[PDB]
Scaffold this active site. Structure first.
Site, PDB file in Angstrom:
ATOM      1  CG  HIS A  68      14.197 -54.885 -45.360  1.00  0.00           C
ATOM      2  ND1 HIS A  68      13.180 -54.086 -44.882  1.00  0.00           N
ATOM      3  CD2 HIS A  68      14.021 -54.957 -46.700  1.00  0.00           C
ATOM      4  CE1 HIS A  68      12.430 -53.683 -45.894  1.00  0.00           C
ATOM      5  NE2 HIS A  68      12.917 -54.201 -47.008  1.00  0.00           N
ATOM      6  CG  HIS A  72      13.597 -60.101 -46.886  1.00  0.00           C
ATOM      7  ND1 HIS A  72      12.646 -60.414 -47.827  1.00  0.00           N
ATOM      8  CD2 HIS A  72      14.270 -59.032 -47.375  1.00  0.00           C
ATOM      9  CE1 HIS A  72      12.743 -59.579 -48.847  1.00  0.00           C
ATOM     10  NE2 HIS A  72      13.723 -58.733 -48.601  1.00  0.00           N
ATOM     11  CG  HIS A 106      17.586 -58.533 -52.117  1.00  0.00           C
ATOM     12  ND1 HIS A 106      17.385 -59.608 -51.301  1.00  0.00           N
ATOM     13  CD2 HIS A 106      16.492 -57.732 -51.932  1.00  0.00           C
ATOM     14  CE1 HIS A 106      16.217 -59.422 -50.651  1.00  0.00           C
ATOM     15  NE2 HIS A 106      15.651 -58.305 -51.029  1.00  0.00           N
ATOM     16  CG  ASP A 107      16.803 -56.102 -48.766  1.00  0.00           C
ATOM     17  OD1 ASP A 107      16.868 -54.940 -49.253  1.00  0.00           O
ATOM     18  OD2 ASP A 107      15.804 -56.849 -48.900  1.00  0.00           O
ATOM     19  CG  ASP A 217      12.665 -57.473 -52.793  1.00  0.00           C
ATOM     20  OD1 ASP A 217      13.376 -58.038 -51.942  1.00  0.00           O
ATOM     21  OD2 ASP A 217      12.436 -56.243 -52.781  1.00  0.00           O
ATOM     22  CD  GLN A 269       0.284 -55.387 -46.651  1.00  0.00           C
ATOM     23  OE1 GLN A 269       0.642 -56.666 -46.800  1.00  0.00           O
ATOM     24  NE2 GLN A 269       1.002 -54.443 -47.012  1.00  0.00           N
TER      25      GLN A 269
HETATM   26  C1  LIG Z   1       8.887 -45.400 -48.466  1.00  0.00           C
HETATM   27  O1  LIG Z   1       8.874 -46.738 -47.985  1.00  0.00           O
HETATM   28  C2  LIG Z   1       9.742 -47.520 -48.796  1.00  0.00           C
HETATM   29  C3  LIG Z   1       9.176 -47.767 -50.185  1.00  0.00           C
HETATM   30  N1  LIG Z   1       8.040 -48.659 -50.150  1.00  0.00           N
HETATM   31  C4  LIG Z   1       8.058 -49.965 -49.759  1.00  0.00           C
HETATM   32  C5  LIG Z   1       6.753 -50.392 -49.841  1.00  0.00           C
HETATM   33  C6  LIG Z   1       6.263 -51.684 -49.490  1.00  0.00           C
HETATM   34  C7  LIG Z   1       6.973 -52.810 -49.691  1.00  0.00           C
HETATM   35  N2  LIG Z   1       6.569 -54.093 -49.385  1.00  0.00           N
HETATM   36  C8  LIG Z   1       5.376 -54.292 -48.849  1.00  0.00           C
HETATM   37  N3  LIG Z   1       4.966 -55.594 -48.583  1.00  0.00           N
HETATM   38  C9  LIG Z   1       5.849 -56.727 -48.805  1.00  0.00           C
HETATM   39  C10 LIG Z   1       5.820 -57.656 -47.605  1.00  0.00           C
HETATM   40  O2  LIG Z   1       4.485 -58.070 -47.316  1.00  0.00           O
HETATM   41  C11 LIG Z   1       3.702 -56.927 -46.980  1.00  0.00           C
HETATM   42  C12 LIG Z   1       3.632 -55.942 -48.134  1.00  0.00           C
HETATM   43  C13 LIG Z   1       4.551 -53.112 -48.574  1.00  0.00           C
HETATM   44  N4  LIG Z   1       3.359 -53.068 -48.012  1.00  0.00           N
HETATM   45  C14 LIG Z   1       3.042 -51.727 -47.964  1.00  0.00           C
HETATM   46  C15 LIG Z   1       1.766 -51.250 -47.384  1.00  0.00           C
HETATM   47  O3  LIG Z   1       1.239 -50.153 -48.130  1.00  0.00           O
HETATM   48  C16 LIG Z   1       0.607 -49.254 -47.291  1.00  0.00           C
HETATM   49  C17 LIG Z   1       0.399 -47.992 -47.822  1.00  0.00           C
HETATM   50  C18 LIG Z   1      -0.258 -47.064 -47.029  1.00  0.00           C
HETATM   51  C19 LIG Z   1      -0.690 -47.421 -45.756  1.00  0.00           C
HETATM   52  C20 LIG Z   1      -1.358 -46.490 -44.959  1.00  0.00           C
HETATM   53  C21 LIG Z   1      -1.798 -46.849 -43.691  1.00  0.00           C
HETATM   54  C22 LIG Z   1      -1.568 -48.138 -43.226  1.00  0.00           C
HETATM   55  C23 LIG Z   1      -0.897 -49.061 -44.029  1.00  0.00           C
HETATM   56  C24 LIG Z   1      -0.444 -48.730 -45.299  1.00  0.00           C
HETATM   57  N5  LIG Z   1       0.199 -49.639 -46.057  1.00  0.00           N
HETATM   58  C25 LIG Z   1       4.055 -50.964 -48.504  1.00  0.00           C
HETATM   59  N6  LIG Z   1       5.016 -51.857 -48.896  1.00  0.00           N
HETATM   60  C26 LIG Z   1       6.043 -49.273 -50.331  1.00  0.00           C
HETATM   61  N7  LIG Z   1       6.832 -48.213 -50.534  1.00  0.00           N
HETATM   62 MG   LIG Z   2      16.125 -53.311 -50.417  1.00  0.00          MG
HETATM   63 ZN   LIG Z   3      14.098 -57.311 -49.935  1.00  0.00          ZN
END
Ligand SMILES: COCCn1cc(-c2cnc(N3CCOCC3)c3nc(COc4ccc5ccccc5n4)cn23)cn1
Ligand SMILES: [Mg+2]
Ligand SMILES: [Zn+2]
EC number: 3.1.4.17
Length: 312
Positions: A68, A72, A106-107, A217, A269
């Site tokens: 962020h 970005h 925005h950030d 975003d 992802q």
């Molecule tokens: C609470 O955290 C803040 C709110 N939030 C942001 C995200 C999030 C935002 N953006 C992601 N991106 C954008 C940039 O390129 C990469 C993907 C994103 N990736 C994720 C990955 O989701 C997870 C979820 C569970 C996982 C568990 C283990 C390992 C990896 C994991 N990744 C969450 N976000 C999910 N929830």
């Molecule tokens: Mg933000």
């Molecule tokens: Zn952003």
């Protein structure tokens, strides 16, 4: 200092592509924002002295966090650029100005911690901004930086037009709070299908803009793979850095923010694209068809995660 800049002719054509990547042009990011504004609102919607003043101050207040940060901001700004350029008719002169500024700020002054963290550990930001915590701070910062000596680029707007532009900026910085995206897309999604969506309807209009913002975003997912793959790490350094502080306070963080579960990054992802990104870019296309290259790039990178998860 900036003002005398002009983008290389090698980039004029590439900069219009949705999958454009700012990454190997670091010392041009400000220039590109000067560029994307002049091409969109012409070279006389802001005094050049005042725009350049404002951008460099915006840059200043982007911290040195992993994801962020100033890189970005510009990347987002660029997406909205490409969106606005592909749907030029559909958005008012005033909206174009706001959405290019709003994205950039925005950030602004982001701490690399989520609202979850700021709220769980009672941060003063969470004391003030009860919901949409960091997102409200981000808009806050746009205000102060605008009120700085010789920074108010909108100062040439009517008193009424001025207030409309702040609203647009404020609304579009808040819509980047992912917590609000689900409801926003859900409601958009039904409006289009049950056939009630109407550009003319100002409440309907704001949702279109909010989803747009969410598309820009997260638009790292829409680039060529060796960009997207690199960007994924940037977010995780930040996430895991959050978890780690939690842990130093005795608290176990959720899987996403736990570096000991990094073998599940493809898993996250792949599930992120399916639960968030793809629906976003589906509803953006359905409503803004000429912005379809985004959905296309998002899918491309999805199967790239598939390939990884099952080993190819
Ligand atoms: C609470 O955290 C803040 C709110 N939030 C942001 C995200 C999030 C935002 N953006 C992601 N991106 C954008 C940039 O390129 C990469 C993907 C994103 N990736 C994720 C990955 O989701 C997870 C979820 C569970 C996982 C568990 C283990 C390992 C990896 C994991 N990744 C969450 N976000 C999910 N929830
Ligand atoms: Mg933000
Ligand atoms: Zn952003």
């Amino acid at each position: 200092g900036l003002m005398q800049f002009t983008l290389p002719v090698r980039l004029c054509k590439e900069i219009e592509l949705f999958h454009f990547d700012i990454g190997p042009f670091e010392n041009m990011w400000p220039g590109i924002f000067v560029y994307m504004v002049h091409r969109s609102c012409g070279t006389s919607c802001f005094e050049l002295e005042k725009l350049c003043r404002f951008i460099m101050s915006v840059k200043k207040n982007y911290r040195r966090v992993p994801y962020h940060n100033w890189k970005h901001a510009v990347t987002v700004a660029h997406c909205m650029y490409a969106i606005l350029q592909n749907n030029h008719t559909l958005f008012t002169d005033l909206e174009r100005k706001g959405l290019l500024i709003a994205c950039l700020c925005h950030d602004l002054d982001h701490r690399g911690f989520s609202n979850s963290y700021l709220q769980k550990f009672d941060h003063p930001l969470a004391a003030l901004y009860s919901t949409s915590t960091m997102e409200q701070h981000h808009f806050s910062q746009t205000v102060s930086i605008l009120q700085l000596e010789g920074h108010n680029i909108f100062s040439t707007l009517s008193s009424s037009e001025y207030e409309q532009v702040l609203e647009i900026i404020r609304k579009a910085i808040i819509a980047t709070d992912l917590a609000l995206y689900f409801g926003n897309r859900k409601q958009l999604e039904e409006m289009y299908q049950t056939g009630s969506l109407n550009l003319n309807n100002q409440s309907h209009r704001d949702r279109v803009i909010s989803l747009m913002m969410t598309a820009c975003d997260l638009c790292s997912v829409t680039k060529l793979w060796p960009v997207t793959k690199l960007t994924a790490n940037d977010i995780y350094a930040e996430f895991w850095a959050e978890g780690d502080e939690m842990k130093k306070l005795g608290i176990q963080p959720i899987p996403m923010m736990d570096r000991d579960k990094k073998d599940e990054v493809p898993q996250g992802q792949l599930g992120f694209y399916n639960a968030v990104a793809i629906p976003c870019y589906t509803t953006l296309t359905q409503i803004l068809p000429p912005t379809e290259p985004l959905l296309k790039a998002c899918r491309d990178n999805l199967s790239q995660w598939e390939k990884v998860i099952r080993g190819e």
